[PDB]
Amino acid sequence: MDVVSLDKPFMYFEEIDNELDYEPESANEVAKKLPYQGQLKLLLGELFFLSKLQRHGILDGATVVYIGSAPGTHIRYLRDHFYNLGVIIKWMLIDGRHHDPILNGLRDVTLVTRFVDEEYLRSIKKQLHPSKIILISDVRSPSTADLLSNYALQNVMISILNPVASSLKWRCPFPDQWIKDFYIPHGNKMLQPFAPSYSAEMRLLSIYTGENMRLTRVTKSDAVNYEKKMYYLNKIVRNKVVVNFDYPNQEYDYFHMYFMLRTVYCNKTFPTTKAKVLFLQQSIFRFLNIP
Amino acid sequence: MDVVSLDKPFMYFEEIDNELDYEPESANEVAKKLPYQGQLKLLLGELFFLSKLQRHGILDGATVVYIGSAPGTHIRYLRDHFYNLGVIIKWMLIDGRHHDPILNGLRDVTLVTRFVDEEYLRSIKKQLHPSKIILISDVRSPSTADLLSNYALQNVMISILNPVASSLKWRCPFPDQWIKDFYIPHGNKMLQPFAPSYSAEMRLLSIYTGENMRLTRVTKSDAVNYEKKMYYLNKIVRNKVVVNFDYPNQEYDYFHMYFMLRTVYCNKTFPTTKAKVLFLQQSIFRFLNIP
Numbered sequence A, B: 001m002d003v004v005s006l007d008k009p010f011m012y013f014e015e016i017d018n019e020l021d022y023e024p025e026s027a028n029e030v031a032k033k034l035p036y037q038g039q040l041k042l043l044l045g046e047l048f049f050l051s052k053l054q055r056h057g058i059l060d061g062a063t064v065v066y067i068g069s070a071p072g073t074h075i076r077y078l079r080d081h082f083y084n085l086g087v088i089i090k091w092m093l094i095d096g097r098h099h100d101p102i103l104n105g106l107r108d109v110t111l112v113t114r115f116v117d118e119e120y121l122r123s124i125k126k127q128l129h130p131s132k133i134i135l136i137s138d139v140r141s142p143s144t145a146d147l148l149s150n151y152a153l154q155n156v157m158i159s160i161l162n163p164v165a166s167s168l169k170w171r172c173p174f175p176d177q178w179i180k181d182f183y184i185p186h187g188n189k190m191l192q193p194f195a196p197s198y199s200a201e202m203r204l205l206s207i208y209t210g211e212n213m214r215l216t217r218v219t220k221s222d223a224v225n226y227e228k229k230m231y232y233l234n235k236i237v238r239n240k241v242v243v244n245f246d247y248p249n250q251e252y253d254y255f256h257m258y259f260m261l262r263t264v265y266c267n268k269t270f271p272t273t274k275a276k277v278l279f280l281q282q283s284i285f286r287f288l289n290i291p
């Protein structure tokens, strides 16, 4: 068995302290081990992000504009969680695909069947006015050409919507398929437990102070680094059994999940962080129908 | 006579401490009092900007990419000034219009007859590589639609060229002709002596540290402010005779010119800042054929 003792898990990209040459043979390995693992991946990251905003006092009273939300099954859990905590939030879920019917019938959640373009963003901005906007983007087109186009749309989302905070899908194109250098908003590169086995995707979390917008250039050399750091994390780290982690499941991803979940606010009072987390995890898995 | 005593002049937009309701009748007033005043305006601002870069040690060894350079008569003075100071610089002047023949025959200056588009910027970036680039933009299309398009081109200039510093033409569209909010690079809003009588134009000076690019949103309310602060500066301030300014010319613009020129480096040693400035001004006016 592949055992190890860890203090904490890697929460952000910058923490990854080692790298490995990407082995293309990894692409043929099993990408997922849990049913609805993708909803789980999204749920934890977004619970993590939104709890932070709550902590900074910027969630309550906001309208969460989630673009690329469908099916959005896990979103029903997020909505219930904050709704039950007394946080006042309006959700606007926009995708050209259809949402899970469990999202219907909630006055606080508006489902829109539209593929957004810059012009549409302008109209919803004029229509949301003057509410404070929290943007979450998970739009998906593959090619580096597709990615760049997505990143370009996401930056137009921030410039038109002018949100107070944002969570953006972020996977750097592969160096061997480099097309051109580009800019992404500055933010924390949140790592994702339960991402596919060899995924290099993270979520870019940003909070917007002032009227400034800070971007950061991404070059092919950055792309080489992303590839090697993420390959190391996936191949080595995520394959560790954290034996000094006293928890029903000691696999790295649960250890990593524990650290995100410990930051979540509950109404119920618990005697230990461990009890809260077990509770939140049980709750999350039951909701998603994960054994 | 309209007299006053001033400590220093307003060097940056942010210093303007008062405002006036823009009077549209000002548009019918004499825009210029000196021959070749526009070359003078550009020369001082660019001498000011480039001297700063020299002071920060980032001029020497750079390639100055000046887009919207034609005719560029005053540019010959700038080139000679740094060339004679021993600073090593290559100039690349690009405009679809023709340059003043005084710019020909200098190995350190390349004249290009091309209207730049994003693609061309990409090719000159690949061709300048790996030199450090200093961008100066003075491109001109009028309409707010024209302006926005210019500002959009200028931001693509910075993103593709990825310069170490930049001077950009910057005049905020009028609030009554607002089309949409937009982003300009963050920088110092350098005020311009000898600008037309009621011009609201300034130069955006920026130095790029790290791989980050900071932008700033400009709204209609910002546009209202720009209009009133600049109107106050033009109507009131620029019309003052700074009587406690002991100089052959005490008009505000010469007082303002003095402060930019005092920052310029000369080979000749002078006993007072006043002697250096008189010298630089005499020199500049002789070069431009201004009496």
Ligand SMILES: Nc1ncnc2c1ncn2[C@@H]1O[C@H](CSCC[C@H](N)C(=O)O)[C@@H](O)[C@H]1O
Pocket (backbone or CB within 6 Å): A042, A067, A068, A069, A070, A071, A072, A073, A074, A075, A094, A095, A096, A097, A114, A115, A116, A117, A138, A139, A140, A141
């Ligand atoms: N312009 C656009 N506007 C809206 N959604 C878009 C988009 N382009 C692609 N997408 C959407 O991006 C999605 C990526 S899959 C998103 C999964 C979703 N976040 C979840 O919680 O289940 C797809 O549903 C796709 O239709």
Ligand SMILES: Nc1ncnc2c1ncn2[C@@H]1O[C@H](CSCC[C@H](N)C(=O)O)[C@@H](O)[C@H]1O
Pocket (backbone or CB within 6 Å): B042, B067, B068, B069, B070, B071, B072, B073, B074, B075, B094, B095, B096, B097, B114, B115, B116, B117, B138, B139, B140, B141
């Ligand atoms: N895409 C573009 N590329 C190059 N120059 C451009 C441009 N669009 C407009 N311009 C140029 O912008 C100029 C504005 S006038 C510039 C004056 C010049 N800076 C001087 O020192 O004399 C015009 O010569 C015009 O042809």
